Every structure is written in structure tokens, then in C-alpha cells.
From a paper:
GlcB generates malate and coenzyme A (CoA) from glyoxylate and acetyl coenzyme A (AcCoA) following the conversion of isocitrate to succinate and glyoxylate by ICL. Because of the essentiality of the glyoxylate shunt in infection and the absence of it in humans, both ICL and GlcB are attractive targets for drug discovery. The active site is an ∼20 Å-long tunnel located at the interface of the TIM barrel and a loop comprising residues 616–633 of domain II. A Mg2+ ion required for activity is bound at the bottom of the active site tunnel in an octahedral coordination by one oxygen each from the carboxylate side chains of Glu-434 and Asp-462, two water molecules, and two oxygens of glyoxylate.
We repeated the experiment following the method of Smith et al., crystallizing GlcB after incubation with substrates and capturing the products formed in the active site. Crystals produced after preincubating GlcB with substrates glyoxylate and AcCoA for 30, 40, 50, and 60 min prior to crystallization were examined for product. Crystals from 30-, 40-, and 50-min preincubations gave ambiguous electron densities with only partial electron densities for CoA and the Asp-462 side chain present. The enzyme crystallized after longer preincubation with the substrates (60 min) resulting in a refined model of the GlcB-malate complex. The active site loop is closed as malate still maintains a weak hydrogen bond with the backbone nitrogen of Leu-461 (3.0 Å) but is too far to hydrogen bond with the Phe-460 backbone (3.5 Å). Moreover, we observed the later stages of the catalytic cycle in the malate-bound structure after CoA dissociation, and we obtained the complete GlcB apo structure in crystals from the longest incubation with an excess of substrates in the reaction mixture.
Residue numbers in the entry: 3 to 303, 309 to 727
Write the structure that this text describes.
């Protein structure tokens, strides 16, 4: 336990991992590496600390600003000049264009779904990386896109009618995406390859594609292919053919399945979807990350799950070519705020988890750039670039600091400059109002921006905590600030020249069980100009790819350039309740909803160390809860409590009223301790109660300190 290197005390469980598993193959001298680590942690920590204090300073000045201006309607011009003078608002920089080179085509060119997965879960990570290709049949059958109404529902045995509905859906999709010259795919009787072009055998005629350029390849014999590979809007569509199969004999063409290129890119998350409070957890995360970059990562289930090898097809000509079988992987480090053990000072204080993440993740990602016996067969980046998305950055200063950190890390690892690219999240109000500046700060490392509306909502609440009673969270979608936020985001991205160089991304779909609703509504994002959008599951990625097959994102971006449909005054518009009063029924509805949402997530975060749970709301609708939604739910209550809408008695009564209901949900597990009826002695209950009753004092409303504290406290009160 504990190993002293330089002025650092490094936990043994980390030192062993880094020196025995990560370092070998990176051609980096362990002594030189650790020395560089000590030097970086020494040089950048004070500059790092100044930023976190600036957050508390700025927030304090604004908090006081609301106190001495009560009841009266807020004067927006005074607000603007105030944020201007205090530094919260920065001048709009001179127009420019990024020059981030050495980026893979999956980011610069290809537009499609993007996955986000907790890296601590091997299975979900493997499925995420393998979600590059996903069955449309399984996605249509398994989900509610095809209703179980009049016709046929689901059951233990395969359903014929539902299967035919799925097939019909897929056929219509094929007709709409890669259309035939005349007729429909629903009438196809077979597929052949004659003279370098695709020939579809209809009962009436025989035909090719309306534009044969959409024919990308095939497998097997030319006159009897096992699969036909097509392409639309950069996304590949694969039609599996096996007339004498499980689904082939039923189909009138022998089509077994329709595989779609789904998750183009995948985010390996070390933040809001995971629970890592100590050294061992970080070691697990880094372990799975290492397995991902090496390619030897596996997970058993009566068989074993591994990463997909690259796919190989026959070109229309006759030669064999190869498409990527895995998703291009980003990795999301933690924010600047939180610290961690693992390595500590000579004194005894924790070290910024962000720096650690930069160094370690950066080090590990080197394996995924090369293909050998030491580094592992599977190669992540073909262009030789490390893609790291940095979340929760407050402004151009912090962005620039992340750039400096990345530069230093690249110096340590011996990587050429700008090897480690950055995915600037847009989920901070200051970052939102200084977006162009944040982009300019990383105008040679930026690979994407992204609307993280959840943390942006939470930050929006906490920033104007003292301004007055906010509205119910379910109303936040109708507020001007968030729409202006999205539009300004896309506009800034396109103005920066992201079209063909970088990605403009949009937030997550949380209703995991409402896939029909997702198909219906999520098409708004690619129609809004979003080069990419976040999906909760591989299936959801498969279903979300449809939108990109229907919407020409590139053309939308071309038709969106120059337009400025977002004013700064709309961005600073606080989502106050104005002069609206809710009925006690609505009040207690919102309170109980929030409390259930809090409990259901914090109980699994604290006890079982799960950073992302499928928790239902109060209307019995399964949502996907992580730190962001928890943050919104906590800050909302911390607002209503701090403005006399509700009291501590109300929130306690609601928590005690919703605690047994949450127990009902998790009463099927094995390692689940019922937090009832002894509410006072449950660490999870205390965690929730503190998250609510002290959320107003949390730095930028962040939920990391409390969660980590209670998680450590749980691990301690169970070790014996
Ligand atoms: Mg976030």
C-alpha cells in the first residue's frame, strides 16, 4: 500500500496496473513517465485550483445580485452589463475556422448516431463498441416501433404476423433509402451481381438501383450472394441472404436480416454513468479501457462476448475490401472539479481526477493506435489520434487550460502535438454564452461540440438559484433559453467551420422503453443540423440511424450556414415561474416525482456503485437516470425549498412516502438492502436528503462530492 514517486504517494493498485499492463508497449520509460507525471501534477495544479475558485466567486457575486434585487422584474440589460463587468460574459472573438487535422472519417464526414456507455461495465462497453453494426429486424421486433395491437403481440415463440410487419417496415425503409429504378424491394425474389452492378429480381421485371453508386459490395458468389452491401448518406446497409434459414424460407427473397451501420462513434464514459470514488474503481475503468484499446477485452455470459473483427466484402468490380467492424471510440474523462485518492500529496490531500484521467487515459489510448502482438490486434484510430471528450468546462479559460494539460500530457507520453483531440461539451452557462471563444481556445484539437441539455439545465437552475422559483422540470423544454441554446450551439459550430471537419452533437434520449416515440420525435435533431446525437442503447442507435438515412445532414448544414437565429438576451433568459401558481396537487406531484427520481438512483449509486440506472418516474415511465438528471432533480427541489414553495417537512414526508415504493422496484435483486422503515439509518436515504437539503450550497450544483462521500462511507461501513 502506497508507493512514493517524487512528491506523490501513489496507491499500489494503480501503480501495479500502470507499470505492468499500461506502460509495456508504449515505448515510454516508466521512470521518465512517472517523473513527467509528478512534474505535470506539480505545474498545473495551482493553475487548476484558481479556476475552481473562480466558479465560486462568480456564482457568489450573482447570488448577491439577486438578493439585493427582489420581487421587481429583472432588468436584462443590467444583467448583461453585470455579467460583462464581472467577467462572466466575454467578448465575441474574431471569426475563424478550426484546423483540427488527423481526424478519422467517422467524425469529419460520416453523420449518424453516437453511443454513450459506462466504461466500468465490460458487457455494455463491448456491446457499445460492437454497436457499429446492428440488426434492424431485432430492433423492430424487440421494441415498440411495431405496435402489439390489432394483429399480433409478443411471446415465447416467434410471431409470424409481427415478423411480417417488421419485414414490411424494413422493405419500405429499403425503398425509401436506396430506391430501385422501378418497383419495390417488397416484391424482390432474389439478388444477383451482373457486370459490376446490382440486379434485383422482381416477379414482373428485373432491375438495378436508381443510382448504382449506392451499391457498395457483396459476399459470396456473384450470381448467388450470401449478402448484399448498399450505401446511403455515408451509412452502409447490409441485406443478409439465406433462402433456407430461420427467416429466409418465409421471406420471398430469402432475406434473413437487414443490418444497419448504427453507432458510428461510442463514448467510453468515466463520468456521469459510472461510480468511481477510490483507486480500485479507477483501476477497473482503466482496465476495461485498456482491453478496449488492445482489443482483447472479453466478457462471459454459456459462451463468451468479444469485440467484432473488421468486416470484409467483395467490391462491385471483384476485389476484396474491408469496412470497420467496431465503433470509433472517444473517452470521456471527469470534470475539473472533483479530486481523487490513488495519488496524493506528501501532505495528504487528493489529486485532481481530471489530470490523472488525462495522463492515464492518454497513455492507454496509445495501444489502440497500432496493431501488434504487444499493443493488441484491434486498432481504434486509423489516423493516429486520441479522442477525449472533456465535460463540465466553465468557459474559454478552462477550455484553454484543458488544452495546456493535453499538451503537457502529449509531451510526457512522447506523442506529437495535438494527438489528443478534444470533444468540447456545451453544458455550462458560461461556456454556452462564450461558445465561440471556447471553440477558438481549442481550434486545433476540437473534434466535436455537443448539447448536453441535462447538466445545462441543472447549471441553469443553480446559476439563478436566488432569482426565484423555477418551473417544473417537465416544462423546461418549452423555455426560450434552451431552444436558443440548441440553435446557438449549432450556429456556432457551423460558423466555426465544423462541416467536414468536426461534429455538432445533441443530447440523450432517456425514455429507453419508448422507441416508437424516439423514431417519431428524435428526427428533429438531424433536421436541426446535428451531425450526431446521443442514444441510450445499441438498439436505439440502430433505430436512430433511420433518421440519418432519411435526413441529409450535410445539405441541412449547408442550408444553415450564416444564419443567427439566437440572441444573447434569449440565452440569459431565466426560466422563472414569473407569476404562476401551481395547485397543491401539482406541487406534491412534482415533489414526489423528483424525490422518487432521486431515491431510485442514489440508492443504486451509493450501495451497489452503479452510476446509471433505469429508474421509472411517478407516471410509471422508465427513464435513464445518471448524475445529470439527479442534478436537475436535486437543484429543482433546492430551489423550491429556498423560495418557500415547499418546506423541509414536505420533502421529508415525500422522501419517506416514496422510499417504500422504490423498494418495490428493487425487490427482485440480491444485494439490495431495503431502506425502510428505518429511513434515518440508511446511508442512501441520507445521501438523497443531503442532496436535496444542501443542494443550494454545492459548487455549481455538482453532485459529485456528496455521492463520493456517501459511497466511501458505504464501502467503509461494510468492509468488516
Ligand atoms: Mg454531462
Amino acid at each position: 500500500d502506497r508507493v512514493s514517486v517524487g512528491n506523490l504517494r501513489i496507491a499500489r493498485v494503480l501503480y501495479d496496473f500502470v507499470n505492468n499492463e499500461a506502460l509495456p508497449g508504449t515505448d515510454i520509460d516508466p521512470d521518465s513517465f512517472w517523473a513527467g507525471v509528478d512534474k505535470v501534477v506539480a505545474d498545473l495544479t495551482p493553475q487548476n485550483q484558481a479556476l475552481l475558485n473562480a466558479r465560486d466567486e462568480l456564482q457568489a457575486q450573482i447570488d448577491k445580485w439577486h438578493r439585493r434585487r427582489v420581487i421587481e422584474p429583472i432588468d436584462m440589460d443590467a444583467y448583461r452589463q453585470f455579467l460583462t463587468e464581472i467577467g462572466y460574459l466575454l467578448p465575441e472573438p474574431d471569426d475563424f475556422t478550426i484546423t483540427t487535422s488527423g481526424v478519422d472519417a467517422e467524425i469529419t464526414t460520416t453523420a449518424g448516431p453516437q453511443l454513450v456507455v459506462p466504461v466500468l461495465n465490460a458487457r455494455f462497453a463491448l456491446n457499445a463498441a460492437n454497436a457499429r453494426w446492428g440488426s434492424l429486424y431485432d430492433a423492430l421486433y424487440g421494441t415498440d416501433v411495431i405496435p402489439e395491437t390489432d394483429g399480433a403481440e409478443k411471446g415465447p415463440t416467434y410471431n409470424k404476423v409481427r415478423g411480417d410487419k417488421v419485414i414490411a417496415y424494413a422493405r419500405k425503409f429499403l425503398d425509401d433509402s436506396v430506391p430501385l429504378s422501378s418497383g419495390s424491394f417488397g416484391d424482390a425474389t432474389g439478388f444477383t451481381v451482373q457486370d459490376g452492378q446490382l440486379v434485383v429480381a422482381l416477379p414482373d421485371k428485373s432491375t438495378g438501383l436508381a443510382n448504382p453508386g449506392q451499391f457498395a459490395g457483396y459476399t459470396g458468389a456473384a450470381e448467388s450472394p450470401t449478402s448484399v452491401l448498399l450505401i446511403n448518406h455515408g451509412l452502409h446497409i447490409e441485406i443478409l441472404i439465406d433462402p433456407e434459414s430461420q427467416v429466409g424460407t418465409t421471406d420471398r427473397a430469402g432475406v434473413k436480416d437487414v443490418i444497419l451501420e448504427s453507432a458510428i462513434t461510442t463514448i467510453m464514459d468515466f463520468e456521469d454513468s459510472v461510480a468511481a470514488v477510490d483507486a480500485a474503481d479507477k483501476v477497473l475503468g482503466y482496465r476495461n479501457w485498456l482491453g478496449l484499446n488492445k482489443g482483447d477485452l472479453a466478457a462471459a455470459v454459456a459462451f463468451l462476448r468479444v469485440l467484432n473483427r473488421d468486416r470484409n466484402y467483395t467490391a462491385p468490380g471483384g476485389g476484396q475490401f474491408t469496412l470497420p467492424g467496431r465503433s470509433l471510440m472517444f473517452v470521456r474523462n471527469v470534470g475539473h472539479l472533483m479530486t481523487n485518492d490513488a495519488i496524493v500529496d506528501t501532505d495528504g490531500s487528493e489529486v485532481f481526477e481530471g489530470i490523472m484521467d488525462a495522463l492515464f487515459t492518454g497513455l492507454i489510448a496509445i495501444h489502440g493506435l497500432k496493431a501488434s502482438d504487444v499493443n493488441g490486434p484491434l486498432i481504434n484510430s486509423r489516423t493516429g489520434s486520441i479522442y477525449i471528450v472533456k465535460p463540465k468546462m466553465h468557459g474559454p479559460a478552462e477550455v484553454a487550460f484543458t488544452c495546456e494539460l493535453f499538451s503537457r500530457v502529449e509531451d510526457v507520453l512522447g506523442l506529437p502535438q495535438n494527438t489528443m483531440k478534444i470533444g468540447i461539451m456545451d453544458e455550462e452557462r458560461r461556456t454556452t454564452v462564450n461558445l465561440k471563444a471556447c471553440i477558438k481556445a481549442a481550434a486545433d484539437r476540437v473534434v466535436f461540440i455537443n448539447t448536453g441539455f441535462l447538466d445545462r439545465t441543472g447549471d441553469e437552475i443553480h446559476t439563478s438559484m436566488e432569482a426565484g422559483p423555477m418551473v417544473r422540470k417537465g416544462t423546461m423544454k418549452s423555455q426560450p433559453w434552451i431552444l436558443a441554446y440548441e440553435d446557438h450551439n449549432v450556429d456556432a459550430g457551423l460558423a466555426a467551420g465544423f462541416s467536414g471537419r468536426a461534429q455538432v452533437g445533441k443530447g440523450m434520449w432517456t425514455m429507453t422503453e419508448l422507441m416508437a416515440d424516439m423514431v417519431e420525435t428524435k428526427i428533429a435533431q438531424p433536421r436541426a443540423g446535428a451531425s450526431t446525437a446521443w442514444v441510450p442503447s445499441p438498439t436505439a442507435a440502430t433505430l436512430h440511424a433511420l433518421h440519418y438515412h432519411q435526413v441529409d445532414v450535410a445539405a441541412v448544414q449547408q442550408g444553415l450556414a450564416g444564419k443567427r437565429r439566437a440572441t444573447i438576451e434569449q440565452l440569459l433568459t431565466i426560466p422563472l415561474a414569473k407569476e404562476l401558481a401551481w395547485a397543491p396537487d401539482e406541487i406534491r406531484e412534482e415533489v414526489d416525482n423528483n424525490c422518487q427520481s432521486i431515491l431510485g438512483y442514489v440508492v443504486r449509486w451509493v450501495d451497489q456503485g452503479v452510476g446509471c440506472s433505469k429508474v421509472p418516474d411517478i407516471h410509471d415511465v422508465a427513464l435513464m437516470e445518471d448524475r445529470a438528471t439527479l442534478r436537475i432533480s436535486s437543484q429543482l427541489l433546492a430551489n423550491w425549498l429556498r423560495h418557500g414553495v415547499i418546506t423541509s417537512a414536505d420533502v421529508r414526508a415525500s422522501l419517506e412516502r416514496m422510499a417504500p415504493l422504490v423498494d418495490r422496484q428493487n425487490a427482485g435483486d440480491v444485494a439490495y438492502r431495503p431502506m425502510a422503515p428505518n429511513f434515518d439509518d440508511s446511508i442512501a436515504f441520507l445521501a438523497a436528503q443531503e442532496l436535496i437539503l444542501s443542494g443550494a450550497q454545492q459548487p455549481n450544483g455538482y453532485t459529485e462530492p456528496i455521492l463520493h462521500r456517501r459511497r466511501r462511507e458505504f464501502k467503509a461501513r461494510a468492509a468488516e
